[PDB]
Amino acid sequence: MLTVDLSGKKALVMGVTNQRSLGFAIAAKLKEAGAEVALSYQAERLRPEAEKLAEALGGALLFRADVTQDEELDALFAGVKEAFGGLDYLVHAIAFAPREAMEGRYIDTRRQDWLLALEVSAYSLVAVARRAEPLLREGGGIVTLTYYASEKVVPKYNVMAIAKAALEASVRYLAYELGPKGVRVNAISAGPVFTKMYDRVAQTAPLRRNITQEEVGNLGLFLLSPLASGITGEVVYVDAGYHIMG
Amino acid sequence: MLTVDLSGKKALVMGVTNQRSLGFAIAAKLKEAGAEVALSYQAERLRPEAEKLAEALGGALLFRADVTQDEELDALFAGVKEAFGGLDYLVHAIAFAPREAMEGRYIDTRRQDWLLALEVSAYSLVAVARRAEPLLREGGGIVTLTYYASEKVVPKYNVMAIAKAALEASVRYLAYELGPKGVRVNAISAGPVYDRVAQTAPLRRNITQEEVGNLGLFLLSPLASGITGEVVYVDAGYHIMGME
Amino acid sequence: MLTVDLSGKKALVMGVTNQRSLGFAIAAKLKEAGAEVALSYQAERLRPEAEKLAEALGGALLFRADVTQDEELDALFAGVKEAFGGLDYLVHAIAFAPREAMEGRYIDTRRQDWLLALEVSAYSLVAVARRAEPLLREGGGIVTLTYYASEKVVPKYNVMAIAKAALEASVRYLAYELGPKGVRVNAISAGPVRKMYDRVAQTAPLRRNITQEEVGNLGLFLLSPLASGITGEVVYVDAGYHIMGMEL
Amino acid sequence: MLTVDLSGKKALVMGVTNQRSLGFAIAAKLKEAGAEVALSYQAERLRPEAEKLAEALGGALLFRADVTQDEELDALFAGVKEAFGGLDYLVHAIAFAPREAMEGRYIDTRRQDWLLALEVSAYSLVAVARRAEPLLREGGGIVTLTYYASEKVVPKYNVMAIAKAALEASVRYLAYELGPKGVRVNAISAGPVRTVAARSIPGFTKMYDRVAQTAPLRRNITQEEVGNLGLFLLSPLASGITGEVVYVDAGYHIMGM
């Protein structure tokens, strides 16, 4: 049998606020594999919520940081450097779009809402990748989350679809720029884990079912682990084959 | 023989600052096909340059407006509605990224610069599309410019590549939202208008701005009435190559 | 006002057997534009049908040739060379898959049926492009038809989907090899032309199906000098249907 | 730590003729994970070579079968069924194009050569998938190999690029048709690797140097990296993945200028 032993490896998981999320599933698999995890949380008032996530994982180091504040991101990574000495994996599970932008039509998106969605959902990957670069050890990597709406029109996804398109293009450019130092950058396009798409996916996908957060966690583990050492700049789909359907 | 007659059609061309540009090329072809053109210009201090452009087109209305200012965009379309009564075509040739963003690596892009690039290069399509919607007549259309860097890594294009990815995704969503009312939205992915491109491209030469202008005219004309949400490449076939 | 004048231009249109074909729509637009057209017909027993098509176009030269027979393709282009002196456009509207292959599942396609579909639907472009190469003048081009099932799974299309995937990849490699001499090669991915039609209309951004004229116009454009900078491209004329990630 | 234990799993690996091949690499990782492997070999005169391969894998059943012969493929699967009772994985590493087709221009490909390339390289996936269907258990899967040339033009790959385009479309359709029964179908798009198969592609050496100098990782991948991706896709870790073409090419394909 094969064994994936990530003991000694260090991971920073961002944008997670609940145990029922893609970001937490990846963190859980990373911990199961033996890696030590650090979780960022947006504001001090969210510390207790983060603490519960840390406990659910069986232990994790916490750091406060709002991804829209460069000063706080600097603090976060100085903190990660001091506590871990370096970094191996970075899980980017940050995503946000104002409610106003998500209600209605994409064409009606307000300037401020559009920019905030792009800033938090796409630019944040750039912001953290740059600060993680000095800490990332050879064989390390960054993995983010995306969705099919980035390439095809999925009604009611609006600016998030555009943000994910920006995120995926960012993944390619970051893979190119961080690749020479042995750091890989990939995106995971997950299927649904609303009821509109969710139910239709189970009916139309080749596997005739929706994926689970564990299946995303498993792909995240694979992509970050040395087993995926030759894979970078990729957008890998774990959607039960839904996206290949016409 | 066949003819494309755009007599009576009205076009708003934005982002044009030079005669040697893709946006101008499209405006020129629309004019040749018989349509009337209105050119937007960014600041009043650029009025003289704008007037030279209008004159080079054989006449064009001019409207001042900076796409980062919603109030100016409102004024732009109020003026277009008053002068034209309606609108048939909108040519979005707006593209910009702060110099600092284009210098160095993409990973080093500063927050403010990154957002300004996306705001001017991608969101602007949304901003103008929303304002053009009420004015656009049936058979109307919106065309924008893009580059293949949106899908493949082209070193040094940096944030502009990401902006184009956002632009192309916006084209698809806008095609979906404006299509029911008969408005088409498409993007033109043009090659450079360098020597490496000529050596690698199937046609072994670079495209000309006229070739981009012709594709723009086609997409906007009723000849392409069944086409929307597309990114059409006019690059002498360069992007199909997996090497060189 | 702009004008497209293809008088003096020569086009060979293949795979057309009816006025409702996309190939006929393109031929009609080319003729309307001023070009002279040549139509191939598979066998003498189909000569009557070809003659009606020629008449429907307002006049056209006919040539017999089955695309699975190299000698007949050799005779076709020898005939085209003699009657036209050269060639400007080649419209490949050939498509076929044995009914057995189209009934049931793709996984159950029989060996001979699978190969015949690929041979007629994809290899034929290579075969005709090779023979047209010596005749195609600068600024000339080849355009073929395809469907999005080549990239997305459209049940029931079965082997034709795979054939179209092969056709599109062939279009790219041919664009690469014929491009240095001024020949353009592109594909047109058309949507359905009219229950099934209602579904497409409901999901397509334009909320309607495309017309055969819309395919004809894209074919005219791509072959015309207006598209001189375009090659190796697969252009969709489907009312935006394929951009939708979910049926409406 | 985590473990991928495939003990009791049965795999049929086809198209392998040398230890320096992507197909062998996947079979090796499968064996290392605990799976039992059966290798097909094209002709009885290659039995000695096949035996050396089996030995190198630490043991593996051998079955003679040429993918262009339906009766032989029937006997192959009848044999696999008799020996394994069922099947979990099918690795399709079969690829072939006549030398004449590969030498010269794609536009000059002869009819018979073109059809043979497509028949062996693409149709074979369909032929073996159909026969494997009744033998494949839930959680089962089929994985095949492909490369960038299928989507973008790489000089000198000629008909193989076309065959891979057909192979990839076949993967999507087979994923759709076998998915209901819990069987997954995926393709691995590998970057250049010094293999016996690569020698048969005139446009390989060109690609090989290019990748190392142009890919984000600034190096070529190894067959082991392809082997690992194959193991992953076939294992339960990839249970939600199907109809996908996964690139393991050091990021080369995302590059433009």
From TrEMBL, chain A:
<feature type="binding site">
    <location>
        <position position="193"/>
    </location>
    <ligand>
        <name>NADP(+)</name>
    </ligand>
</feature>
<comment type="similarity">
    <text>Belongs to the short-chain dehydrogenases/reductases (SDR) family. FabI subfamily.</text>
</comment>
<feature type="binding site">
    <location>
        <position position="22"/>
    </location>
    <ligand>
        <name>NAD(+) 2</name>
    </ligand>
</feature>
<feature type="binding site">
    <location>
        <position position="94"/>
    </location>
    <ligand>
        <name>NAD(+) 1</name>
    </ligand>
</feature>
<dbReference type="GO" id="GO:0006633">
    <property type="term" value="P:fatty acid biosynthetic process"/>
</dbReference>
<feature type="binding site">
    <location>
        <begin position="66"/>
        <end position="67"/>
    </location>
    <ligand>
        <name>NAD(+)</name>
    </ligand>
</feature>
<dbReference type="InterPro" id="IPR036291">
    <property type="entry name" value="NAD(P)-bd_dom_sf"/>
</dbReference>
<feature type="binding site">
    <location>
        <position position="17"/>
    </location>
    <ligand>
        <name>NAD(+) 2</name>
    </ligand>
</feature>
<feature type="active site" description="Proton acceptor">
    <location>
        <position position="157"/>
    </location>
</feature>
<comment type="pathway">
    <text>Lipid metabolism; fatty acid biosynthesis.</text>
</comment>
<keyword id="KW-0547">Nucleotide-binding</keyword>
<keyword id="KW-0444">Lipid biosynthesis</keyword>
<feature type="binding site">
    <location>
        <position position="66"/>
    </location>
    <ligand>
        <name>NADP(+)</name>
    </ligand>
</feature>
<feature type="binding site">
    <location>
        <position position="66"/>
    </location>
    <ligand>
        <name>NAD(+) 1</name>
    </ligand>
</feature>
<keyword id="KW-0443">Lipid metabolism</keyword>
<feature type="binding site">
    <location>
        <position position="97"/>
    </location>
    <ligand>
        <name>substrate</name>
    </ligand>
</feature>
<feature type="binding site">
    <location>
        <position position="67"/>
    </location>
    <ligand>
        <name>NADP(+)</name>
    </ligand>
</feature>
<feature type="binding site">
    <location>
        <position position="95"/>
    </location>
    <ligand>
        <name>NAD(+) 2</name>
    </ligand>
</feature>
<feature type="binding site">
    <location>
        <position position="164"/>
    </location>
    <ligand>
        <name>NAD(+) 1</name>
    </ligand>
</feature>
<feature type="binding site">
    <location>
        <position position="17"/>
    </location>
    <ligand>
        <name>NADP(+)</name>
    </ligand>
</feature>
<feature type="binding site">
    <location>
        <position position="164"/>
    </location>
    <ligand>
        <name>NAD(+)</name>
    </ligand>
</feature>
<dbReference type="GO" id="GO:0000166">
    <property type="term" value="F:nucleotide binding"/>
</dbReference>
From TrEMBL, chain B:
<feature type="binding site">
    <location>
        <position position="97"/>
    </location>
    <ligand>
        <name>substrate</name>
    </ligand>
</feature>
<feature type="binding site">
    <location>
        <position position="95"/>
    </location>
    <ligand>
        <name>NADP(+)</name>
    </ligand>
</feature>
<feature type="binding site">
    <location>
        <position position="15"/>
    </location>
    <ligand>
        <name>NAD(+) 1</name>
    </ligand>
</feature>
<feature type="active site" description="Proton acceptor">
    <location>
        <position position="147"/>
    </location>
</feature>
<feature type="binding site">
    <location>
        <position position="94"/>
    </location>
    <ligand>
        <name>NAD(+) 1</name>
    </ligand>
</feature>
<dbReference type="InterPro" id="IPR002347">
    <property type="entry name" value="SDR_fam"/>
</dbReference>
<feature type="binding site">
    <location>
        <position position="193"/>
    </location>
    <ligand>
        <name>NAD(+) 1</name>
    </ligand>
</feature>
<feature type="binding site">
    <location>
        <position position="193"/>
    </location>
    <ligand>
        <name>NADP(+)</name>
    </ligand>
</feature>
<feature type="binding site">
    <location>
        <position position="22"/>
    </location>
    <ligand>
        <name>NAD(+) 1</name>
    </ligand>
</feature>
<feature type="binding site">
    <location>
        <position position="21"/>
    </location>
    <ligand>
        <name>NAD(+) 1</name>
    </ligand>
</feature>
<feature type="binding site">
    <location>
        <begin position="66"/>
        <end position="67"/>
    </location>
    <ligand>
        <name>NAD(+)</name>
    </ligand>
</feature>
<feature type="binding site">
    <location>
        <position position="22"/>
    </location>
    <ligand>
        <name>NAD(+) 2</name>
    </ligand>
</feature>
<feature type="binding site">
    <location>
        <position position="66"/>
    </location>
    <ligand>
        <name>NADP(+)</name>
    </ligand>
</feature>
<feature type="binding site">
    <location>
        <position position="15"/>
    </location>
    <ligand>
        <name>NAD(+)</name>
    </ligand>
</feature>
<feature type="binding site">
    <location>
        <position position="15"/>
    </location>
    <ligand>
        <name>NAD(+) 2</name>
    </ligand>
</feature>
<feature type="binding site">
    <location>
        <position position="66"/>
    </location>
    <ligand>
        <name>NAD(+) 1</name>
    </ligand>
</feature>
<feature type="active site" description="Proton acceptor">
    <location>
        <position position="157"/>
    </location>
</feature>
<dbReference type="GO" id="GO:0006633">
    <property type="term" value="P:fatty acid biosynthetic process"/>
</dbReference>
<feature type="binding site">
    <location>
        <position position="164"/>
    </location>
    <ligand>
        <name>NAD(+) 1</name>
    </ligand>
</feature>
<feature type="binding site">
    <location>
        <position position="67"/>
    </location>
    <ligand>
        <name>NAD(+) 1</name>
    </ligand>
</feature>
<feature type="binding site">
    <location>
        <position position="42"/>
    </location>
    <ligand>
        <name>NAD(+)</name>
    </ligand>
</feature>
<feature type="binding site">
    <location>
        <position position="17"/>
    </location>
    <ligand>
        <name>NAD(+) 1</name>
    </ligand>
</feature>
